[PDB]
Structure 1
């Protein structure tokens, strides 16, 4: 079955620029700015569109070694990006997949809001509780603030 967890968080970066830097070029940018959270991102197959597979590796000592993401949909107009965690780490006999959706919306102050939905597809009577998905949110937040810090400091990047 499916457990749906939704959150929002704010960014000080405008939606289009954040979408281009953090989501689209996130494969280059995230390991450079947050190497203590993400050790590398390997493109396995594809050019970034639906069906593209990436292997996200975590630093030594983390609970999980890696996950593989599959890009599902990329909407450049509405700054929506949908991807699934389909292998690795927690994926196995208790968790089949995680289907994720990020949408970035402009705020009139020149920042953005990130709307996130994470759907945990389980196998068995295995439960996913808000407490534990908190680590997903903490990760996301750390990555976001690392990207924002970079973008604030490198004004000519991703315009």
Structure 2
């Protein structure tokens, strides 16, 4: 049965510049996300690793997923991870690999460049509705982080 990759690319915009945005939303995600969205996470636990590349994290929602860290680039503001266990995975979708890149905008903020790679087996049936519902949920989480950082200008400086 046919192996393939379905790639979906999207961009979000922030008034926050890449260094502060990467420090708060990516590097302190385990602490910042439950502070801003308490109803979103029940408990996030490290299975293996020290917090860098190769770390295995279990995540429970207020639903259970297992992520593996693939890449962290503290200078170029690039973060990579993989969904290696969850309800989204099946015989059709064997894995989901993500990449987030923070680029500086003309305004002085960020362009958040997100890539989703669905690793597929056999016939490919991917619904626009499901992809778009996940985009809206990601967009909302990013806007809560943005709000919190604008309200707390000394934090993650």
TM over 0.5: yes
1:83 aligns with 2:71: no
* SS of corresponding position for 1:28: helix
Aligned 8 A contact 1:37 1:139 in 2? no
Deviations 1:109-147 (A, max 9, x none): 221010010011123324222221112211211110111
Report the TM-score when normalising by structure 2: 0.90
1:112 matched residue in structure 2? 110
* CA displacement at 1:92 relative to structure 2: 2.9
Question: Which residue, 8, 12, 16 being the options, matches 1:13?
Answer: 16
2:93 matched residue in structure 1? 95
Cα distance in 1 between the residues matched to 2:41 and 2:9: 23
Q: From the superposition, tell whether residues 33 and 54 of structure 1 become closer, same or farther in structure 2 (CA, over 3 Å).
A: same
Cα distance in 1 between the residues matched to 2:139 and 2:43: 18
More strand by share: 2
Q: From the superposition, tell whether residues 138 and 37 of structure 1 become closer, same or farther in structure 2 (CA, over 3 Å).
A: farther
* SS of corresponding position for 1:138: helix
Greater Cα shift, 76-85 or 130-139? 130-139
Instruction: Count how many residue pairs are aligned between Structure 1 and Structure 2.
Output: 154
Aligned 8 A contact 1:28 1:41 in 2? no
* SS of corresponding position for 1:110: coil
Cα distance in 2 between the residues matched to 1:124 and 1:31: 38
* CA displacement at 1:70 relative to structure 2: 0.6
* SS of corresponding position for 2:7: strand
Q: Which ranges in structure 2 are unaligned for 5 or more consecutive residues?
A: none
Cα distance in 2 between the residues matched to 1:132 and 1:84: 18
Report the TM-score when normalising by structure 1: 0.89
Q: Which ranges in structure 1 are unaligned for 5 or more consecutive residues?
A: 60-64
